[PDB]
Design a protein around this ligand. Structure first.
Ligand code: CLA
Ligand code: CLA
Ligand code: CLA
Ligand code: CLA
Ligand code: CLA
Ligand code: CLA
Ligand code: CLA
Ligand SMILES: CCCCCCCCCCCCCCCC(=O)OC[C@H](COP(=O)(O)OC[C@@H](O)CO)OC(=O)CCCCCCCCCCCCCCC
Ligand SMILES: CC1=C(/C=C/C(C)=C/C=C/C(C)=C/C=C/C=C(C)/C=C/C=C(C)/C=C/C2=C(C)CCCC2(C)C)C(C)(C)CCC1
Ligand SMILES: CC1=C(C/C=C(\C)CCC[C@H](C)CCC[C@H](C)CCCC(C)C)C(=O)c2ccccc2C1=O
Ligand code: SF4
Ligand code: SF4
Ligand code: SF4
Lengths: 66, 49, 161, 739, 43, 99, 96, 30, 80, 31
């Protein structure tokens, strides 16, 4: 029973947590098919890993807060 | 009791220059041991006590 | 819980000869275990072979009062504890035979393990094993009487303490 | 990284003509009758031919399409036989009275008496496989949905059989396609398991649970609409399941509490069917599906991110275990038996968990109502799970002989169990002996105390308690979990722990199973017969390459009879022979699990509920004071429950009377191979070849006795066949009569 | 000749003995649908 | 008895005495080849055959001693009547010796 | 004497037993071209040295089962002795 | 007061510093 | 120990010497056969009764034969 | 569970000093 309020971008923090976390933590981090150009040493699959993990780390958090 | 055992093992055993780094104790103990713990107890009073 | 700390090991081999069929583990050579086993009366330095079997008989004769008196057939009757005394004394005698039967058969020499670096020198002669057998019967019977004396009146010692 | 060879093997009938083309020694032609048995033995053993792992792996992957075809032909056959030759449409109207039946028997020799009256104007064999519970659980209403499924299965059986031709004889993969185990685990965990359970979660919500809710109202069978009208006419997904008008937007605004009508957490049994709630299975397979799609994004592929298994295993090492798990990647990415040992000991152990998690939590409509079905589903997958664990132990011993390498497996955890393998076995030898006396000898104690007229000295509920404290406690935690450690549930995970009695009509669906002194003994018999089975199988794995008796056992092979009569005698030293001895203990262990089940459930669970809630069990409640003596297992279980299997002549259970005696025969027949030896029977044939030489009927292919390994293999195959089929025919004729 | 390999496959040991024992068993089955219960010759 | 002095698979069996295990895994293996081993296999049959002569003795007389000759003459032609009316039915007094 | 190096392994439970004190004990020496991984007949893997090696084994059966395993390393120089507990070393393999 | 059960949890948990105090006091030498 | 009898029918195949795992057997020169050598068993106190030597011999019937005799410690195959 | 006083207090009163003093006396008098 949590409709989208304007301040439900908790996941936008959670996504911003993730690639701020996982930039310094990947072993390879620039495989192929880059997003040219984009800040941070990412390829396109590495950045859509962090935005996918933050979109999963953020869904459990909003439901945790009911 | 585990921490004192751990910091006697040879690569976990601190060097001499770690002990005589006096400016770094004063920053961590004043801000953290004194300051955060006084902040945490103020969090304990307001939320709980 | 890093020990030495990310390194190194404990199963170094027995006596630094890997071609011997034994290893040093934390059950072999942990110095609380090695101190315990070396100081049982079978292994303690400075004991007569009569003196070794005297403590071994008092210990094994002590707890064998237990399962006869509380699980035997007479355990509901008035002789519930006397049935455990005759069973415990009656089975030390069956062990006194087996010690004397082992001793008279020209018994082999005792081993030397890794937690015990020597056999205690009284366990290689027929005369040495016979003193161990004569002590076991004396201490085994006496160790079962003192278990019979304590458990037969449990309300009295607890009132007198 | 897909690279595929173009036409390696020409499709021809050339090699169908000469038999045994695969091996160079065996293709030169038969000389004795030993050649006939080695053709059928070395047939699907593709590893013995070459050293080319690329060539062997293509045969292995294509033959795996062959086994997928015969399962689909079998499965679409069971739907087709259930379409024509069944009473499925008469079973749906009254599952409390109509018995599940297929397999109408041709009437030729008087075997039309096997077509007995199951109810519904239909004569046939009362099935116990439970396919009517599955098809109702799928939501099939009429026969035409069974035809198009079965005809659809026959098409799907043809695509598997065509691709097996295609991916071997036409377009075969290279080696490095197979060793992409990071790429394999990502597709197989996500698309097969995750997307398979996500798609099936869509099948309960839109299709199955609307139909099974209309069935529980007792509306009709024909008047329930077709399940594609539930998708078209959305007004019928809103009469039932009212949390549906909000549509698709509460999924994406994270208003997942809007969906609380049809993704529930009811946690218990449906009081109408005695099965699980269909809405709980919907939220199950959906929540199952999210976890698999996430966890299948773990291993590294062509796009850089992800874990590497060669870098996961080599980090996990400790002080005790030296190099740890360093080197186990090369064992599991080169050898096929190391994969086959792992995927079979853990799928066989999974199958036993499925059997325990389906009798207490019956997942189908009217499954716990039919006692004849629920007994046989357990006892089926028990045996299927037990053969595979012995197979994982078998194909691990084959790994140690052929595929073990000292250079890779230096000082890792595989190497460190071969240093202390004497400490492993002899400490396991003690526990098997310790559990033998203190579990079975407490039955021999109770046999003698009751025979001596001393019932007060027994290990029973009355005389000397042995109450299972550590399992009576865990039942009290799982009883009190709703409201406590899992507040969102209503009843427990099952009623086997606590709760109450749920009756469906008259028959008990599930009752709280109370553990006592007899349940202490028989759960420690189980630990005894399992640790002894481990003792035999692990000794064949650790001592596969050598021992103190044979220092070069891996030089001889996995499967050799002996090393001669010397050293006292060295017969049955091989790694094959420890698989041979473990099949008996597997038979011994699993026969008591299915005897514990078939008499605890009849004495303490199953039965008929009266009006006031009094539960009248099948055997009157006699497991307590009779499952503590071996006389009681003989009197009240084997003797008393066989009064329906041997008195069944002139009735529809006549075949179970014939399979009961006919399996006592084949069991006893197997002892001729086990007890006797080969060298007797070769001498006897020499006196029969003489009478065949005299009248000039001498065969050109010389007769030989069966070899030493084969005479053991024939003697265990005929042993396990007649011993299980005795129980197969005993469980059915007892429970198709009292159920 | 691809057709000769099918005559040569139909005359191996298990394939010929499957067909011949099927014709043998089918004669005994279709004799017993029409003339059943023949315990002895009626004379 | 007749092959005790040797045969094709193993000549000169007289040089090895009466009871010897085998001659190895060679020549296909020789498990239970000795003349003692043919004593050994026969005592399974000899205990079996006297089972048959004493199951049949005992159950024909249980009809004479009880006055029911019709139970044996109907049911001893097929092997369930041996299994049911003799093994199963008579062991009810026995197994209830202690309950 | 014998005077050989001992291969690299962490010890086994196979090893030697009480017979090596009491009745007899064997020992096999071989001169290896390099250091590599072989198998012990006592059980497990080991690592030979370069030059003359030495492995105290329990029975004569072990050293000839090992010598066949050394033959696929181009090592045909292995010599088994019989070391009695009185110190009597007997050259037994080969005969010359 | 507290229940009779909870006293035994406190005794078993107290073996964890009792073991670790014996490890520290012997790592500090004899 | 056991007893290893070698008859005069073998051909000097050297398959029995290369199969006895305790190395009981050895070849001695003998002007009879084509390969001009016969197997000999000078160390039968080491024989463990394995009958690998009877399995590997070609000639029919076997030129080598192991008679199982009194079993000492070396022929029982005991490491203890 | 007030009966634990009957089993911890005599152990600390009697058994703990007897085990400690008999260890320390044999440790200080140890060549
Ligand atoms: C933020 C990080 C941090 C923190 C939390 C600590 C914390 C600590 N360090 Mg430390 N240390 C740090 C960083 C840190 N250090 C760094 C970076 C270095 C290296 C440069 C060191 C080097 C170092 C050394 C070399 C030693 C310590 C020690 C200690 C301990 C001090 C003794 C103690 O417990 O007094 C606790 C004190 C307080 C909680 C504050 C008390 C304030 C006054 C006295 C009382 C006020 C209380 C008030 C009146 C109310 C009380 C009433 C209530 C009780 C009822 C303490 C756990 C010593 C130790 O014991 O080692 C384990 C020690 O020998 N540290
Ligand atoms: C055929 C010989 C035989 C005889 C005469 C007995 C006699 C007896 N057995 Mg028994 N038993 C036998 C064979 C025999 N057993 C075998 C073969 C087994 C193995 C299956 C057992 C296993 C067995 C068990 C497990 C138990 C008995 C028990 C008993 C006693 C039951 C009466 C009672 O209440 O004890 C009342 C009397 C006593 C409790 C004590 C009597 C004094 C004892 C016997 C000896 C006293 C010292 C003796 C004089 C000198 C040393 C012993 C000597 C033999 C060297 C009785 C003495 C029960 C018992 O009490 O055992 C102790 C019991 O628990 N038996
Ligand atoms: C803190 C530990 C502690 C504990 C638990 C006790 C407990 C007791 N003391 Mg005490 N005492 C202590 C310290 C302690 N004392 C110290 C430090 C001193 C020195 C000032 C004394 C001096 C003292 C005197 C002078 C006397 C006591 C007495 C007593 C007993 C009074 C109850 C009664 O009527 O006895 C009823 C019980 C008995 C009479 C006998 C009980 C059985 C005894 C204790 C042991 C039996 C054998 C044993 C199991 C094995 C060998 C002993 C073992 C310690 C090695 C009781 C057992 C009185 C007493 O009875 O002493 C014997 C007494 O006269 N105490
Ligand atoms: C995932 C399943 C699986 C797979 C793929 C394999 C694959 C293989 N196994 Mg393995 N195995 C398995 C499960 C499996 N096994 C299980 C579960 C067991 C335990 C019983 C074993 C026990 C086992 C042993 C002990 C051995 C193998 C061997 C082999 C290899 C050759 C087998 C062969 O050619 O048989 C050809 C097929 C046959 C000989 C037919 C056997 C027919 C059986 C005995 C009767 C079936 C009864 C049937 C249900 C009832 C019929 C009734 C009748 C009236 C019609 C091959 C790599 C052998 C080997 O050397 O590996 C290299 C070997 O020695 N396996
Ligand atoms: C009923 C038949 C039977 C029995 C009793 C056993 C017994 C045993 N088998 Mg076994 N086995 C059997 C059939 C049987 N097997 C068959 C048919 C096969 C063919 C496949 C095998 C294959 C087999 C293998 C392959 C292995 C065993 C193992 C074992 C041992 C398990 C340890 C144990 O529980 O001992 C405890 C003893 C009992 C449970 C028997 C009851 C004895 C009572 C409690 C006490 C005796 C009463 C009394 C005191 C006697 C004294 C009286 C006095 C007058 C003399 C044990 C010796 C394993 C082993 O040895 O490792 C542990 C093992 O590896 N067996
Ligand atoms: C072994 C060979 C064999 C032989 C000689 C026969 C012979 C016969 N079958 Mg027949 N049949 C056989 C195998 C055989 N069957 C098999 C294997 C099947 C199963 C597919 C059938 C199924 C079958 C049917 C369904 C029918 C016959 C019928 C007949 C009869 C009419 C003539 C004919 O061939 O058609 C004739 C007596 C017909 C008949 O007269 O029955 C009423 C008929 O309707 N058969
Ligand atoms: C080995 C012993 C044995 C013997 C002697 C018999 C004998 C017989 N059985 Mg039986 N039976 C046996 C084993 C045996 N069976 C077994 C093991 C089973 C279990 C599978 C059965 C199950 C069984 C059933 C269920 C039935 C029989 C029937 C019959 C009768 C054959 C009826 C018929 O039409 O044939 C005569 C056949 C022909 C004349 C065809 C031959 C024509 C040739 C080819 C012409 C040649 C021209 C030159 C006959 C008395 C049937 C019967 O009538 O019972 C009395 C019957 O219904 N038996
Ligand atoms: C105890 C549970 C256990 O696993 O201990 C753990 C211990 C090994 O622990 P480590 O943390 O050293 O393990 C490192 C690797 O095993 C995991 O990477 O095992 C042994 O020392 C052998 C166990 C003998 C087991 C005796 C029974
Ligand atoms: C290690 C350990 C353990 C174990 C232990 C035990 C359990 C022990 C036992 C105990 C016992 C087992 C005890 C014993 C003791 C003894 C005694 C207490 C004795 C006494 C005796 C006496 C007192 C006698 C005397 C006499 C004589 C000698 C002769 C004459 C007569 C008379 C009577 C005077 C435990 C578990 C804790 C845990 C861990 C550690
Ligand atoms: C019976 C038996 C034999 C002899 C059994 C043999 C040789 C098998 C023969 C049985 C089959 C059924 C014979 C089939 C012969 C023809 C191929 C079939 C002719 C009929 C066709 C129509 C099929 C052994 O060699 C043996 C060895 C070791 C332990 C136990 C035993 C054992 O019990
Ligand atoms: S299996 Fe037969 S031939 Fe082989 S050792 Fe055993 S008894 Fe001898
Ligand atoms: S006995 Fe056999 S192996 Fe030896 S020489 Fe003669 S034929 Fe060759
Ligand atoms: S007994 Fe036989 S197998 Fe053993 S060494 Fe002698 S000849 Fe070879």
């Amino acid at each position: 029973w949590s409709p989208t309020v304007g301040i439900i971008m908790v996941i936008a923090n959670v996504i911003a947590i993730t690639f701020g976390r996982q930039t310094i933590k990947y072993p390879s981090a620039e495989p192929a098919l880059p997003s040219a150009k984009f800040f941070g040493g990412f390829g396109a699959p590495a950045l859509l890993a962090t935005t996918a993990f933050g979109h999963i780390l953020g869904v459990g958090l909003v439901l945790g807060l009911h | 009791l585990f921490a004192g055992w751990l910091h006697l093992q040879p690569k976990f055993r601190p060097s001499l220059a770690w002990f005589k780094s006096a400016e770094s104790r004063l920053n961590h103990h004043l801000a953290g041991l004194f300051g955060v713990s006084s902040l945490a107890w103020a969090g304990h009073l307001i939320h709980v006590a | 819980l890093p020990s030495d700390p990310r390194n190194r090991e404990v199963v170094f081999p027995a006596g630094r000869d890997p071609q011997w069929g034994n290893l040093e583990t934390p059950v072999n050579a942990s110095p609380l275990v090695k101190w315990f086993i070396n100081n049982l009366p079978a292994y303690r330095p400075g004991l007569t072979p009569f003196r070794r079997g005297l403590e071994v008989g008092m210990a094994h004769g002590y707890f064998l009062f237990g399962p006869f008196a509380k699980l035997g057939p007479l355990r509901d009757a008035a002789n519930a504890n006397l049935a455990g005394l005759l069973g415990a004394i009656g089975l030390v005698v069956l062990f006194t035979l087996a010690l004397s039967l082992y001793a008279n058969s020209n018994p082999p020499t005792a081993l030397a393990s890794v937690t015990v670096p020597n056999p205690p020198d009284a366990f290689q002669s027929k005369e040495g094993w016979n003193n161990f057998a004569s002590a076991f019967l004396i201490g085994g019977i006496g160790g079962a009487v003192v278990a019979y004396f304590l458990t037969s009146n449990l309300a009295l010692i607890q009132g007198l303490v | 990284r897909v690279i595929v060879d173009k036409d390696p093997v020409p499709t021809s009938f050339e090699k169908w003509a000469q038999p045994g083309h695969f091996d160079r020694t065996l293709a030169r032609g038969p000389k004795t009758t030993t050649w006939i048995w080695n053709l059928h033995a070395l047939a699907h053993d593709f590893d013995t031919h070459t050293s080319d792992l690329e060539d062997i792996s293509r045969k292995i992957f294509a033959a795996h399409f062959g086994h997928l075809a015969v399962v689909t032909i079998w499965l679409s056959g069971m739907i087709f036989h259930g379409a024509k030759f069944s009473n499925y449409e008469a079973w749906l109207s009254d599952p409390l009275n109509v018995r599940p039946s297929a397999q109408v028997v041709w009437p030729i020799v008087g075997q039309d008496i096997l077509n007995g009256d199951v109810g519904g104007g239909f004569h046939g064999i009362q099935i116990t496989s439970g396919l009517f519970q599955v098809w109702r659980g799928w939501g099939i209403t009429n026969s035409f949905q069974l035809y198009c499924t079965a005809i659809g299965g026959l098409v799907l059986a043809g695509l598997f059989l065509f691709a097996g031709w295609f991916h071997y004889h036409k377009r075969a993969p290279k080696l490095e396609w197979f060793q992409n185990v990071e790429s394999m685990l990502n597709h197989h965990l996500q698309v097969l398991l995750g997307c398979g359970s996500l798609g099936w979660a869509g099948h309960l919500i839109h299709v199955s649970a609307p139909i099974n809710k209309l069935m529980d109202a007792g509306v009709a069978v024909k008047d329930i609409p077709l399940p594609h009208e539930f998708i078209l006419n959305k007004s019928l997904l809103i009469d039932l399941f009212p949390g549906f008008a909000a549509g698709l937007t509460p999924f994406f605004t994270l208003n997942w509490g809007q969906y609380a009508d049809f993704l529930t957490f009811k946690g218990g049994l449906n009081p109408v069917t005695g099965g699980l709630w269909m809405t709980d299975i919907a939220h199950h397979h959906l929540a199952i599906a999210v976890v698999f799609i996430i966890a299948g994004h773990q291993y590294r592929t062509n796009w850089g991110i992800g874990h590497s298994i060669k870098e996961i295993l080599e980090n996990h090492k400790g002080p005790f275990t030296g190099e740890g798990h360093k080197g186990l990647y090369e064992n599991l990415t080169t050898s096929w038996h190391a994969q086959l040992a792992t995927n079979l000991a853990f799928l066989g152990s999974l199958t036993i968990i499925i059997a325990h998690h389906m009798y207490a939590m019956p997942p189908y409509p009217y499954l716990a109502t039919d006692y004849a079905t629920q007994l046989c589903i357990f006892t089926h997958h028990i045996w299927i799970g037990g053969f595979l664990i012995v197979g994982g132990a078998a194909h691990a011993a084959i790994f140690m002989v052929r595929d073990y390498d000292p250079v890779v497996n230096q000082n890792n955890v595989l190497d460190r169990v071969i240093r202390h393998r004497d400490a492993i076995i002899s400490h396991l030898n003690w526990v098997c002996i310790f559990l033998g006396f203190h579990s079975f000898g407490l039955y021999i104690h109770n046999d003698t105390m009751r025979a001596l007229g001393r019932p007060q000295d027994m290990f029973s509920d009355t005389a000397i308690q042995l109450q299972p404290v550590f399992a009576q406690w865990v039942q009290n935690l799982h009883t009190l979990a709703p409201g406590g450690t899992a507040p969102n549930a209503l009843e427990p995970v099952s009623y086997a722990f606590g709760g109450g009695v749920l009756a469906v009509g008259g028959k008990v669906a599930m009752m709280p199973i109370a553990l006592g002194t007899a349940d202490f003994l028989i759960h420690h018999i189980h630990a005894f017969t399992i640790h002894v089975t481990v003792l035999i199988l692990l000794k064949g794995v650790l001592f596969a390459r050598s021992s103190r008796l044979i220092p070069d056992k891996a030089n001889l092979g996995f499967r050799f009879p002996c090393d001669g009569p010397g050293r006292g005698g060295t017969c049955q030293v091989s790694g094959w022979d420890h698989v041979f001895l473990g099949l008996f203990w597997m038979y011994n262990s699993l026969s008591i699990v299915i005897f514990h089940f078939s008499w605890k459930m009849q004495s303490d669970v199953w039965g008929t509920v009266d009006a006031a809630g009094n539960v009248s069990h099948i055997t009157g409640g006699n497991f307590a004071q009779s499952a503590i003596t071996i006389n009681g297992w003989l009197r009240d279980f084997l003797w008393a429950q066989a009064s329906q299997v041997i008195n069944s002549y002139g009735s529809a259970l006549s075949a179970y009377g014939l399979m009961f005696l006919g399996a006592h025969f084949v069991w006893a027949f197997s002892l001729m191979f086990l007890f006797s030896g080969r060298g007797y029977w070769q001498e006897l044939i020499e006196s029969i070849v003489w009478a065949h030489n005299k009248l000039k009927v001498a065969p050109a292919i010389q007769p030989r006795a069966l070899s030493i390994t084969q005479g053991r293999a024939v003697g265990v195959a005929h042993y396990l066949l007649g011993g299980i089929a005795t129980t197969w025919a005993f469980f059915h004729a007892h429970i198709l009569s009292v159920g | 000749d691809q057709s000769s390999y099918l005559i040569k496959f139909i005359s191996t040991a298990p394939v010929a003995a499957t067909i011949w024992l099927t014709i043998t068993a089918g004669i005994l089955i279709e004799f017993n649908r029409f003339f059943p219960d023949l315990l002895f010759h009626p004379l | 008895a007749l092959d005790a002095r040797g045969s094709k698979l193993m000549p000169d069996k007289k040089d090895f005495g009466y009871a010897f295990p085998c001659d190895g895994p060679g020549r296909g293996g020789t498990c239970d080849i000795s003349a003692w081993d043919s004593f050994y296999l026969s005592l399974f049959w000899a205990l079996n055959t006297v089972g048959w002569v004493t199951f049949y003795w005992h159950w024909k007389h249980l009809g004479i001693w009880q006055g029911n000759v019709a139970q044996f003459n109907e049911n001893s032609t097929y092997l369930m009547g041996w299994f049911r009316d003799y093994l199963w039915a008579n062991s009810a007094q026995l197994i209830n010796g202690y309950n | 004497t014998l005077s050989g190096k001992t291969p690299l392994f962490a010890g086994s439970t196979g090893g030697l037993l009480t017979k090596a004190v009491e009745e007899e004990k064997y020992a096999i020496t071989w001169t290896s071209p390099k250091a590599q991984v072989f198998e012990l007949p006592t059980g497990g893997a080991a690592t030979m040295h370069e030059g003359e090696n030495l492995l105290y084994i329990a029975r004569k059966e072990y050293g000839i089962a090992l010598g066949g395993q050394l033959r696929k390393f181009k090592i045909t120089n292995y010599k088994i002795y019989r070391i009695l507990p009185s110190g009597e070393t007997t050259f037994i393999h080969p005969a010359d | 007061s507290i229940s009779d059960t909870q006293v035994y949890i406190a005794l078993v948990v107290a073996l964890i510093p009792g073991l670790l105090a014996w490890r520290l006091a012997t790592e500090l030498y004899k | 120990s056991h007893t290893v009898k070698i008859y005069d029918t073998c051909i000097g195949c050297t398959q029995c010497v290369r199969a006895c795992p305790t190395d009981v057997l050895e070849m001695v020169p003998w002007d009879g056969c084509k390969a001009a050598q016969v197997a000999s068993s000078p160390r039968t106190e080491d024989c463990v009764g394995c009958k690998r030597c009877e399995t590997a011999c070609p000639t029919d019937f076997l030129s080598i034969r192991v008679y199982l005799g009194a079993e000492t410690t070396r022929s029982m195959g005991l490491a203890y | 569970a007030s009966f634990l006083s009957s089993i911890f207090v005599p152990v600390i009163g009697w058994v703990v000093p007897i085990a400690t003093f008999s260890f320390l006396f044999l440790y200080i008098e140890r060549e």
